[PDB]
């Protein structure tokens, strides 16, 4: 059921847009995917790290593996801007 499409890069491409601004948790990825993902995760959930592999193989972003600063929800990836490609490879299509 849902019959999803298998698209690793785009799976990013719409986990990165989840941040509006510069900013994604992959706690909050996770718990995205599921949204759209619920047969796919709930049959392949053990694939939540192959994404991450891909995830910051993709944009190439940094994560805050337990910063001092926030109580421990999530993480904060932001984009380096050494890609800046997938930002807005066309202009703003």
Known sequence: MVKPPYSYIALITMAILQSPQKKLTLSGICEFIS???????????????????????????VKIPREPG???????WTLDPQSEDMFDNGSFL
């Open 35 to 61: 949204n759209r993902f619920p047969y796919y995760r709930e049959k392949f959930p053990a694939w939540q790290n192959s994404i991450r592999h891909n995830l910051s193989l993709n944009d190439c972003f």
């Open 70 to 76: 926030n109580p421990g929800k999530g993480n904060y």
